[PDB]
Design a protein around this ligand. Structure first.
Ligand SMILES: Nc1ncnc2c1ncn2[C@@H]1O[C@H](COP(=O)(O)OP(=O)(O)O)[C@@H](O)[C@H]1O
Ligand SMILES: Nc1ncnc2c1ncn2[C@@H]1O[C@H](COP(=O)(O)OP(=O)(O)O)[C@@H](O)[C@H]1O
Ligand SMILES: [C]/C([C][C]N=N=[N])=[C]\[C]OP([O])([O])=O
Ligand SMILES: [C]/C([C][C]N=N=[N])=[C]\[C]OP([O])([O])=O
Lengths: 244, 256
């Protein structure tokens, strides 16, 4: 019961300012860091520039309103699946058996909720040692035609099915700050996140939901070499932790 | 008025060279589909994106040792990457499509592909985003994992969506009395029925061929829906068949 659920956010695996650009060097290092830690893990990744660009250009997250969005949805779904291959290639190269599980090809959505009615394939892939890799995708919706699922929602489902000991968000920031550290030089790192969120980004809300059953959720900078490796081994690193 | 089409691995890949995609052939076949103007749904095989590694690790035998797991995930990645290449050509010709990997959402039991949840595949077809299934490694309820073929993917979609016509696209003009690559004096079979399938059942067939290929087409047929096996390497032959014209092919009929 010591599995660690990891999200390779789109901020580190892709260049979000450059459409369809894969950060092969960062993902290759992150996969090597994952293997050397010797931990049992499951990998979710974001869509990044392989989806967010065409998404809001056609407002895909708002549902099916025009037939012109159908080729756009297919192109987005083709890109997220292609990105997942590049991620899986790096996992396989390190000796981590993994397979892409596209949510848009397997599940449906209803009122912003990812619905996983059939859990057997994901569970059977896990028991075989072939890590099921979910990711942000365009998903059929029961009310809006289609919708968008995030990497965080995919993790919430896997957090429910497999009860990880730790949950780790890998992004391009040292942690949660008072504001965007890229735009506000007067940003200060927040070390702990509890239900003290009552004072107020909304990432505290996203981190806290996965702290069910006294497990700790971490948010760490993947652009810092070996930080993720040390985190997985239990060594103290710079990060934001959600607890309680 | 939907037509179910299998883009076999023998024509969309170089089956003699691992991980080799025949882009231009697929680009032509997609353009022939667009030019036909038919409501279609496309399944494709794995070809050398699945068979080469499956033979070296006996994946068709199921989970027998831990050395197979890295090979199974390697094939699973290869079939998904090949499917992306196929979808890319479909999108280029104005055919919205999405890859639906059977190993990512289905299981198998006793050599049959179990589809317990039909909603996603049906919702994608309703939106106009063609669900494209393909040959893959699939978790098995009894043997750990199992290999599913394009022919089996075609069966469940035939069961699900009830096409009026089924087309098998391969690297051969049709079914022959023996393998045409190893027998020059072999002739083509024009029509396939349940009667001739029993006529092709031999001891060699049992110990294995042509009987299983006939059975694959016959399972796509019923009282009036026919199955056609056409050569994808013949330019515009798939186009003419989709238009309703007569072409050199093998026809299955009557069901079984
Ligand atoms: N209060 C904040 N603390 C930390 N980062 C923030 C904050 N507000 C905005 N950001 C920005 O959000 C980005 C990460 O969010 P996002 O890219 O959506 O996550 P993901 O990496 O999962 O896609 C960071 O690059 C950071 O610049
Ligand atoms: N009786 C037969 N008739 C036609 N082809 C045969 C026969 N026996 C063996 N073959 C071989 O099978 C090959 C096609 O089979 P396969 O690759 O499974 O089709 P697909 O590519 O549609 O899956 C042909 O290249 C042919 O050489
Ligand atoms: C996929 C998405 C969207 C795009 N397209 N559309 N509607 C998102 C996900 O999320 P992330 O962030 O995790 O990546
Ligand atoms: C997945 C694969 C591999 C295995 N092997 N076997 N029995 C294949 C697919 O299928 P196709 O259709 O391609 O042939």
């Amino acid at each position: 019961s010591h599995m660690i659920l990891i999200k390779l956010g789109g901020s580190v695996i892709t260049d979000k300012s450059e459409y369809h650009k894969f950060n092969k060097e960062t993902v290759s290092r992150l996969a090597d860091e994952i293997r050397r830690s010797g931990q049992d893990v499951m990998v979710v990744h974001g869509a990044g520039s392989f989806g967010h660009v065409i998404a809001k250009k056609y407002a895909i997250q708002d549902g099916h309103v025009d037939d012109g969005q159908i080729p756009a949805a297919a192109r987005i779904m083709c890109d997220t699946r292609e990105l997942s291959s590049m991620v899986v290639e790096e996992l396989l190269a390190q000796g981590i058996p993994a397979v892409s599980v596209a949510p848009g090809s397997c599940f449906v959505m209803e009122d912003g909720k990812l619905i996983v009615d059939n859990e057997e394939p994901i569970r059977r892939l896990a028991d075989l040692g072939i890590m099921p890799v979910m990711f942000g995708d365009v998903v059929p919706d029961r009310k809006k035609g289609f919708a968008a699922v995030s990497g965080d929602q995919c993790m919430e489902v896997l957090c429910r099915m497999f009860d990880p000991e730790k949950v780790v968000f890998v992004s391009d920031i040292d942690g949660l700050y008072t504001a965007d550290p890229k735009t506000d030089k007067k940003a200060r790192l927040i070390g702990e996140v509890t239900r003290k969120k009552l004072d107020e980004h909304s990432k505290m809300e996203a981190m806290l939901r996965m702290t069910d059953r006294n497990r700790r959720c971490y948010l760490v900078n993947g652009n810092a070499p070996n930080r993720l490796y040390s985190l997985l081994k239990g060594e103290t690193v710079t990060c934001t932790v959600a607890k309680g």
